[PDB]
Each structure stands twice: as structure tokens, then as C-alpha cells.
Point group: C5
Chain length 213, copies 5
């Protein structure tokens, strides 16, 4: 206790200084662009509906970005290096699947981890239905599917996207899924439209899969 | 540092426009024109036992409010910004013959530009009334649904399209259904119940089972 | 030009702010100040009849009308505004409910009303309803008959009286390619008395006879 | 008129009343020193469905809830003779009466509004659709299937919340005449239970239904 | 009638002092132990087309904060109380291999005791990754799902069970599935990326079609 009481007190002081003086960060702009790193950890192809061409995925989607406005000096806060906080208390990026066919279902607590250098890690678990023809899922080559993820409203001048590796993390893939993974890549792409001079960034999730035996 | 002066300018801009009374919507004396456009991504499902068809599309909405205007020079050259759709008024555009609530697939964020213009592009899945008869045939099926304001007549909201062609350039190439044609047409209507003019955009889609 | 537009806009702000205060939300009807709600249905589709569970699914506009002194204003003090649109959450709405649904109603329309300067309100929620209905004989010429009551969940006739403007359901919107065709569709006010109580209960009983399209 | 005045004055009596019970003053719930009796009663409307590949049955019913709070009493003569009012269920405390063996969330089908009367008593009657645990084995027979589900507080033991019924017969005067399922019997019975783990009594109302396919 | 007003004002008084005269979650300095146990009511559905299985259970969560302590003597000898689960902090315990959002079957209400202990027992319906193959045989099928904080390491939240027995005394005797065995076991996990320990409770269930 006491120190415990003071530890608590430090965090609460940190949280208020960060949030309640200087209202919420207004998102990136062309002047103050931001890079968002994404990585997918695929857990499960739950279902492949060949009457509709929809496949359902369960995955953890890791988001990392970093904001100056969220740094503090740990020395000033009883040496708190980082803390967990609700996603409602901070700006999060608007990363969406560009071809889902149902609202994404969130499977995990909406809480992020923020570090003293202003970097935020946020890892939502999701079930997604997206546009995918599962033809050849019963063959040796299996079926191939793709879905792009990106910011819904920000172009490349405000949000840049990157990955650590083009390899999707399969280390958590359900061993007894109806389907088995031949490959899972996650690839940064730059889209140019003719309408518009600004580039748009997405990460392309490509999965090649196949009925298990 | 300069990066912190931009944030500050934006925060200030948003506060001026939002924290200092939300537009109460259009009036006969002060009507609004909303531009609509569809980008058909997919016909996911044709249900011949209930006559329901499920579409996924982007729905572009565009409009312009004087009270959303600023002079960029007083805000460090900011020419536009992105903000939650909750912060502004948005039009009550709806499908007139859906059979399930629409399912919003994209985040509710809008871009506001310094001339007061707003662009909002919700992705949707919609079930609407549609007889898919003929879909298994060279000529395919034709379906139609209308969109417009739910509570404003054409004295308050007028609608408009940029082209009467649905944008099909992201239509999903391995859909169960290919598209023969897809058109979005402004229409003005007079109903016996109701003496005000009614404006809608008619979405007409001819489609067949892929081969 | 932009100046005419700003005053008219500010006159609406003013009207709203004046109505939605002094003296905030009207507490609902009483025995001393009862209220009459007119309903009318506009049937768009019988989407589905499930004979394995005896549930049928209707899509309709449920048109509701009523009048509140508390929502009156003089157009003259408000730059000639005779009516305006407002989210239904800003005002009191009646608790009209199907008595025999089997799923929560799904709302298919923005929930916004029209208030006119005499205090009258017009509110048109579009709905999809699953209600108890045995669709037997639907595949014959004489078809099936199903019925559902709508009324206030909690007010007696001493507080909310219902009426219809007509006993016919409005079919002008009915989908010409539904699996189901309408033979008749009526909407009739009924007064019920129970045995617990001395107060009457009012409902509009919606009766639909339908069959498969051939 | 001086009717348009009286009306105006009936509204202000109600708005005032609501203001004195609601803003001025919110029951923190029952306690061991201040227990509460909840009266429960069912009006069964329909057995909508019986899944025998999962052993779920879906019922539709209205659940009558009734209790009384000193803190909700008022003197009608101070309030223009108002003897009772309607109000959103969110303005008042309500009991956590729950099904103990539901299998998906209860579906509410009626507006959440209660009636409060000057003696401090509240009647609240939500219509609901419940999926609960039930084998319909033998539903296609003469003798039928039996199912049970208990209802009662989720977190209050009998020392804080007690339950009673006005009758043991579930009310069937609104059962749907053309349901797939007719009702052989439906009863609603107060049970008291005592566990080893625990000194306190546990109250529930046991809802039991014998039904068979309509034939 | 007057001592009921008293004891009532006392509780109100307590809730005031606890909740608005006044937890930001646990930390490395101030860690917290959550005790969990499961009461399994039903395996509703085992789906071989998708490899999902649906359970109905009560999940007891139990923990203790110094900040919720009080001295009964100063509060009419109130020894505990019930309160909405939004009035207080709760731990982010999460199934790590669910495939649908958990559905809540019970009122979101907790019991707070004067020593600052909190007990929270939500009823849930869950879908999780489970191959039901063999459920039709005598040896049944076996499925596991781990449960843990999503965002805190072992440095801030530790977990425990009072028993590794999943309590089956309320199992639905008429389920389609009979439980062969059901356990709930703490697990510590050490990774290559990370010095932090990671704790979960592993819910493992062996079950077969009822005979
Ligand atoms: C299958 O859909 C429709 C089918 C048919 C029609 C309109 C439809 O629907 C659409 C419906 C509106 C607007 C644009 C549409 O494209 C309706 C409307 C509405 C309002 C107020 C009302 O009373 C005061 C009312 O009756 C209304 O409903 C009508 C009015 C006329 C008709 C039917 C329903 C006949 C019209 N005719 C040619 C037959 C074919 C205000 C706003 N809303 C709610 C939008
Ligand atoms: Mg740009
Ligand atoms: Mg008009
Ligand atoms: Mg006409
Ligand atoms: Mg008008
Ligand atoms: Mg009465
Ligand atoms: Mg009465
Ligand atoms: Mg007790
Ligand atoms: Mg107790
Ligand atoms: Mg850690
Ligand atoms: Mg840490």
C-alpha cells in the first residue's frame, strides 16, 4: 500500500495530463503525416461459402503508430514507462477491409498500450467476411483470396502504411481448422487513381488455402 | 514544432466550426443539393425464395454548407480535414425498398473542404426487394431500387448525379453474378398522397449468374 | 443572397432551441390531457412465411400522427417557418407496439419526424416485423389470413385513443413481384375491455389475407 | 379556453411530480435491512420453435413484474389528483430478474416503460423472446415434451430479494391459437433453495411447460 | 420504515464516497490477481462444417482493490453491496480463440465486499475453434480454449483458479452432449520476443453425443 497508492496516483496524474489538457489529437494531416505499421496474425478460416463467394476469417490485426503529443518524461511520473488505456481515450486509425461483405465483428477488448515515447500499440481481434471465390479449395493447389486494408478517408499524404514483413504470422493458426494454409502474405501497395493526384496506400492480404485431409 | 503548429491550427479550425451550433438541415427557403453516386462492388446473394437481393456498394454523398466554410489563410493554409460524421449534419438518404436494416461497412468519417463542401462515402450492404427470375439466362434479371431523403421533399433536398452510369470499375470479378448494366438516374415524382415534389435516384441493375 | 439564407437558418435554430426548452419534454398523455394517435399502414411486402414456425415477415411504413399544444408556434415570430424536421429522439413519440410479434422490430428508415406549427407531428417509421402467423392455405386460391394488433404498450384509452383515417391498408407501395399477393388488407380500430380493469384498451388490428403469386 | 389552461396545468403537475421523485432525491436497490418482494407472473403467447438438433426452445411471453418502494410514494392531493403515471423504465430502479438457463440473449419486444402508482408500487411488463435449454423429445407424441426454466435475481439472494406469484397457473388466455405447439400445462412455482456453500435462501420462480405439436 | 430510510441513505452514502469522491487498472508496481472459475451449463451446438462449438457457461471473476475497502461501522454495518459493473473497473478477461463476439446472458452487476473484494459472474454464450470429430464415438472430442487478459502481461495481472475442476453441477442433464471431463488450469508462457510472463487459464473439455 502507500507506494501502491502513490503508483496508482502517478498513473492517474499521467492519464489526466495527457488527455484533459490539450484536447484529443485531430488525426494526421499533409503537414503532420503519420506512418501506421500493420501486421496480421491469422488464426482461422472459419467458413468458405461457395453459394455467395464469401469467406470468413478470424485474425489479430496489430496496429502501431507513434505521436509526439503522447510522449511523457517517465522521471516526472514515478518512472512509468507505459500504460494501458481504452481506445476511446485516444485517436485510432480508420483501417478497414476494402471488400468485406458484413460489418467486421470485434472479438477483443478495445484497449491499447501507449509507451512514453508516444507510440501506441493496438491489436484488435476480428471476424471478417469478405469477397472470395473458394473454387479449388478441394484441389491440391487450393483456392486463392485477397482483401485490401487501408485508411478509409486519408490518402498517402496523411497516412502511410507499412508492414514489418510480408509474411503473415501463421504461428497461431488453428491446427484443426477445416482449412489449411498454403500461404499468407501481407503486402504494401501504392494505388494511383486518374481522378486524383495523391497516392493511396493499402496492405493486401493474400491467402492461399485448401480443405484439410 | 511546425508539425505542432499545424495540429494546433486544425484543432482551432475544428473548434471554431463545431464548438462555437450544428446546421439544422435545409429549408424550403434554403434548399440543399446532394450529389449521389454508387460504386457497385458485389451482388452477394440472390434469394428467389423471398425475392431479396443483397448488394455491397460504396455510396458517395457530396454537399456544401456555407457554415462549413473557412478562409485557409487564417488556419495555416489548411484546405480540408477529416472528421467523424457525427460532428456534422449528414443527409438522411435511404433506400426506399430495403427489407433489412442497411449494414454500414466503413467508418463514419467525412472530408470537409474549405468551401464548405463535404464528401461522405459509406460502404453498405443492403437487402432490397428483387425478383431474380431470369438470372440463370443469357439475358439475366433486372432489379431496381430508389434512394432519396426519407423526410425531406425536393423543396428541401434536391438530388443530383455526376453520371447516370454506375461505377463498375471495382466490381468484384469473381462474384457469383456478372453485371450486364447498372444505371443511377435522377427522377422527379409527384404522388397523389403528397403534393410536394419528390426526388430520388433510381438504381437499376441487370445481372446474371457467371459462367 | 447568403444573408437571406443565414437568417432563415437562424430562425430555425431559434425555433428548435425555443421548443426543446421552456419547459422541456412534454411528459406524455394523462387522463386529464388524453391524446389521439392516428395510424395507417402502407404495406410493402410480405417477405416470408415460415410454416415450420408460423411466423410471417412484413415490411411496411407505419404512419403515426398526433398533435401537441406544447409544440405550437406562430410562423410570424419565426421568419415564416411553417414546419420543420427533427430527429424523433428530440420529441416524445407514442409507444405503439405489435401485440404478437416474435422478434424485435427492425427499423429500416431514419427516425426523423415532421413538426408543423399547429403542433401536429407526422412520423413515418419503415419497419420489418415478424409476428405470429399460420400461413396455411397460402398456396391455394383462397389463401391465408393473418392478423396482428397494434396499440400502446402502457396507456389505456383514457390516455391514448387510437384512430385510423380509413379501414383500408394502403397498398400503393406493394411490391408487384413479391412471392405473395394481397387479397385484402384492413386496419381496424377495436376497443377491448378486460376483466381486471374498468378502463378501455384500444388497438388497431391489422388483418391481411394473402396467397402465393401464380 | 380555461380547458387549454387546465390541460397545461395537468402537464405541469406531472412534470413536477416526476421532478420531485427523480432529480430532487435513486433507490440503490434492496438490502438485507430493506428487502424487496418482486411479484412475477407469466402470460405465455407462443412456443415459436423447438430445435432438437440443439435442444433449444424459443418462447414468447409477457413477464409481469410488480414491486413497491417507499421512495416512490406521493400524495395525489399535492399533485393535481394524479394517482399514477407512465415512465421510462430507465428512470427507475428495476429488478435483475433473469432466466437461469437461457442460451442466447433475451429479445425484448415491447417498449421499456413502467407504471408507478401513488402508493409507490410499480408494474413493469416486458414482452420477451427466450431461447432456453429444453429437449423437445416426444413433442411429436400424445404425452409431449416437458421443459423447465427458472427465473430470479442474478445477484440478490433471498435476504434481499424475495419472489412471489399471485397464482401457480401461467396465464394462457392469450396463447396463440394457431401456434405449431399447443400447451398441455404451464405452471409458475416459487421455489426456495438452500446450498451447502452458503447460509442464505435462494428464491426462483420455476416455469414448467408441457407442450406437443398441433395435430 | 424509518430505519429502512437510514440503512438506505447509508448505502447511498457509501456509493458516493466510493465512486465520485474517488482505479486506472493494475501496474507493474501495483499488480492484481484475478481468480477465475467456470460453471459449464451447456454445449449447445458442435458444428463440423465450420469447426466451431458453442458453450453456455457462468464465468466467475474475483479480485480485490484497496480502493474499494471501507469500514462497516462507519456505514451502518454494511458488509457488502451490489452495483452495476460500469460503476467499477473490471478486468479484460478474453477467450483467445473465439470466432464470434461473446454474447452476454446475465445482468452486468457485481458484488463489492468491505475488504475491497469484487465478485463478477457473467453468463456467456461463446463460439470457439473446436473440431468436433469423434464426438459420435465413445472417446468423444476434445476442445480447448484459453482465457486471459488481452493487454496486460503477468507483470500486471496474474490469474488463478480455486480449483482446476470446471464445476459441472449445473450442466444441463438433457444436453445433446455429455461431458466426459472439463478442466480449468493456469498456464505460464515464456516467449522469445519478450521477457514478460503471460498467463491464461486453459479451459479444456472432452465431450460426446449423449447416449
Ligand atoms: C415501393 O416504393 C414506392 C412505390 C410506389 C410509390 C412510392 C414508393 O415510395 C418512395 C416513397 C416515398 C418517396 C420516394 C419513393 O421513391 C414515400 C414517402 C412518403 C411520405 C409521406 C407519405 O404520406 C404523407 C407517404 O405516403 C409516403 O409514401 C408513399 C408515397 C407515395 C407512394 C407510396 C408511398 C406511391 C408511389 N407510387 C408511384 C406507387 C409505387 C414522405 C417520405 N416517404 C416515406 C419517403
Ligand atoms: Mg488529400
Ligand atoms: Mg416539403
Ligand atoms: Mg399516384
Ligand atoms: Mg412540407
Ligand atoms: Mg388508465
Ligand atoms: Mg390505469
Ligand atoms: Mg446474502
Ligand atoms: Mg449477500
Ligand atoms: Mg508487461
Ligand atoms: Mg509492460
Amino acid at each position: 500500500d502507500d507506494d501502491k497508492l502513490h503508483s496508482q496516483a502517478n498513473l492517474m496524474r499521467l492519464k489526466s495530463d495527457l488527455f484533459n489538457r490539450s484536447p484529443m489529437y485531430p488525426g494526421p494531416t499533409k503537414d503532420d503525416p503519420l506512418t501506421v505499421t500493420l501486421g496480421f496474425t491469422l488464426q482461422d478460416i472459419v467458413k468458405a461459402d461457395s453459394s455467395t463467394n464469401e469467406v470468413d476469417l478470424v485474425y489479430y490485426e496489430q496496429q502501431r503508430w507513434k505521436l509526439n503529443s503522447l510522449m511523457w518524461d517517465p522521471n516526472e511520473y514515478g518512472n512509468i514507462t507505459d500504460f494501458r488505456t481504452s481506445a476511446a481515450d485516444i485517436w485510432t486509425p480508420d483501417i478497414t477491409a476494402y471488400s468485406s461483405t458484413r460489418p467486421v465483428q470485434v472479438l477483443s477488448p478495445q484497449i491499447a498500450v501507449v509507451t512514453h515515447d508516444g507510440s501506441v500499440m493496438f491489436i484488435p481481434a476480428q471476424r471478417l467476411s469478405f469477397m472470395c471465390d473458394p473454387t479449388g479449395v478441394d484441389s491440391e493447389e487450393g483456392a486463392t483470396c485477397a482483401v485490401k486494408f487501408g485508411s478509409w478517408v486519408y490518402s498517402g499524404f496523411e497516412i502511410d502504411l507499412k508492414t514489418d514483413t510480408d509474411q503473415v504470422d501463421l504461428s497461431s493458426y488453428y491446427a484443426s481448422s477445416k482449412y489449411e494454409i498454403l500461404s499468407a502474405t501481407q503486402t504494401r501497395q501504392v494505388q494511383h487513381y486518374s481522378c486524383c493526384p495523391e497516392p493511396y496506400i493499402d496492405v493486401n492480404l493474400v491467402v492461399k488455402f485448401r480443405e484439410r485431409r
